[PDB]
Amino acid sequence: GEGQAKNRLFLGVDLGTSHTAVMSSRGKKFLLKSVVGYPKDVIGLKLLGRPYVVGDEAFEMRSYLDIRYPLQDGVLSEISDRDIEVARHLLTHVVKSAEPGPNDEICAVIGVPARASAANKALLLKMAQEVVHTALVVSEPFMVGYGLDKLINTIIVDIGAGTTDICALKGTVPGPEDQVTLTKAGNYVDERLQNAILERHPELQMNVNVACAVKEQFSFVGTPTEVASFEFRAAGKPVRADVTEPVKIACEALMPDIIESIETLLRSFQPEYQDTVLQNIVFAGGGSRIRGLAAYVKEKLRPFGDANVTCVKDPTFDGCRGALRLAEELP
Numbered sequence: 001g002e003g004q005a006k007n008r009l010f011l012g013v014d015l016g017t018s019h020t021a022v023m024s025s026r027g028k029k030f031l032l033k034s035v036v037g038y039p040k041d042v043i044g045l046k047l048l049g050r051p052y053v054v055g056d057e058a059f060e061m062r063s064y065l066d067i068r069y070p071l072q073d074g075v076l077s078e079i080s081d082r083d084i085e086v087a088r089h090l091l092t093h094v095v096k097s098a099e100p101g102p103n104d105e106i107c108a109v110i111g112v113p114a115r116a117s118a119a120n121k122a123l124l125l126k127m128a129q130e131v132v133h134t135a136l137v138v139s140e141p142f143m144v145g146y147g148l149d150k151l152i153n154t155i156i157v158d159i160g161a162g163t164t165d166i167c168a169l170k171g172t173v174p175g176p177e178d179q180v181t182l183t184k185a186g187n188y189v190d191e192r193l194q195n196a197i198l199e200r201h202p203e204l205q206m207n208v209n210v211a212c213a214v215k216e217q218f219s220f221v222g223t224p225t226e227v228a229s230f231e232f233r234a235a236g237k238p239v240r241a242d243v244t245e246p247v248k249i250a251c252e253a254l255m256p257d258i259i260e261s262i263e264t265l266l267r268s269f270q271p272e273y274q275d276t277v278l279q280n281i282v283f284a285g286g287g288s289r290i291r292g293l294a295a296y297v298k299e300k301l302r303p304f305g306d307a308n309v310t311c312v313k314d315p316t317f318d319g320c321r322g323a324l325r326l327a328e329e330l331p
C-alpha cells in the first residue's frame with residue numbers, strides 16, 4: 001500500500017460566508033471570495049469562455065454576471081438544490097487551485113459557519129465527498145479552537161460583518177445554549193460610525209462603505225492613543241476630519257452584548273473550571289483586529305475574575321491552518 005500512503009493530499013478549507021481560505025499539506029495557501037459568477041445569457045457564456053468564474057474575479061466582474069454566494073450570510077438556512085451546485089462549483093475550484101496530482105487521494109477538513117444546521121452540514125458533506133475523496137465537515141469555532149490547542153474550557157468570540165458568533169468549547173458536541181449569535185457586528189459598527197460622523201460633519205459625502213474604510217483604518221476601543229484623522233470628500237473636494245470619538249463610540253457599541261454573552265456562557269461551565277475558561281477567551285474574525293480589544297475586554301471581565309484575552313494572530317488563515325492540522329493529525 002505504498003501508493004495509498006504517498007499519494008495523499010490533505011486540505012484545510014475555511015469555507016466561509018464571505019471568503020474561502022485554503023492550506024494544503026504541500027504548502028499551498030490562498031484566499032478567495034466565496035462567490036461564483038455565472039453568465040447572464042448565451043452571449044455572456046461565449047464572452048466568458050467557461051461556464052462560470054469563481055472567487056475574486058467573479059466579484060470583480062459582478063456587473064456583467066449573475067453572482068452567487070452559496071453560504072447565504074447565515075446559514076439562512078436550508079441550502080437549496082441550486083445553491084448546493086453553486087457550492088460544488090466553489091469547492092471544485094478551490095480543490096483544483098490546490099493542484100492535486102492525478103494519483104492523489106484528497107482528504108479535506110472543511111470548516112463551515114457556526115450556525116449551519118445539521119441538515120446543511122450533511123448536505124455540504126455529501127457534496128464535498130463528490131469533489132474530494134474523503135471529507136470531514138466541522139464548525140468554524142471548533143477549527144479555530146483546534147489550531148490553538150483550545151478545545152475545552154474555552155470561549156471563542158468571532159466578530160464578523162453580519163454576526164458576532166460566540167461559542168463555548170467543552171470537548172463535546174455543542175448544546176443548544178453553548179452558542180450565542182449577535183446581530184451587532186462589523187456592519188452595525190459601520191452604521192453607527194456613519195451616523196456618529198454625520199452628526200459632527202454633516203457636509204461629508206458618506207455611506208457605509210466610507211464608514212467601513214474609516215473603521216478598518218482606525219478601529220479601536222478604550223482611551224484613544226492616536227488621532228483618527230481621515231481624508232474625506234465634501235462637495236467633490238478633499239477634506240480631512242478628526243473622527244476619533246465617532247470611531248470610539250461605534251467600536252465600543254459592540255462590546256456590551258459580547259460581555260453579556262461571555263457571562264452567559266461562562267456560568268454554563270462547571271464552577272471549578274470557570275477561572276480556567278477566563279484564561280481562554282479568544283477573539284477571532286475581522287473584528288478581532290480592533291485596536292486595544294484584548295485589554296479592553298480583560299478590563300470588562302474583571303467582575304468575573306482575571307481573564308487572559310487573546311486575539312487570533314491571523315484571522316484570515318488561522319482557521320484553515322487549524323483545519324489542515326486536524327486533517328493531517330486525525331487517524
Ligand SMILES: Nc1ncnc2c1ncn2[C@@H]1O[C@H](COP(=O)(O)OP(=O)(O)NP(=O)(O)O)[C@@H](O)[C@H]1O
Nearest residue numbers: 017018160161162163186187216219285286287289
Ligand atoms: N481592522 C479592522 N477593524 C475593525 N473591523 C475590521 C477590521 N478589518 C476587518 N474588519 C471588519 O470585519 C468584518 C469582516 O469579518 P469576517 O470575519 O471576514 O466576516 P465574515 O464572518 O466572513 N462575514 P459575515 O458572515 O457576513 O459576518 C467586516 O465588518 C470588516 O469591516
Ligand SMILES: [Mg+2]
Nearest residue numbers: 158160161285
Ligand atoms: Mg463570521
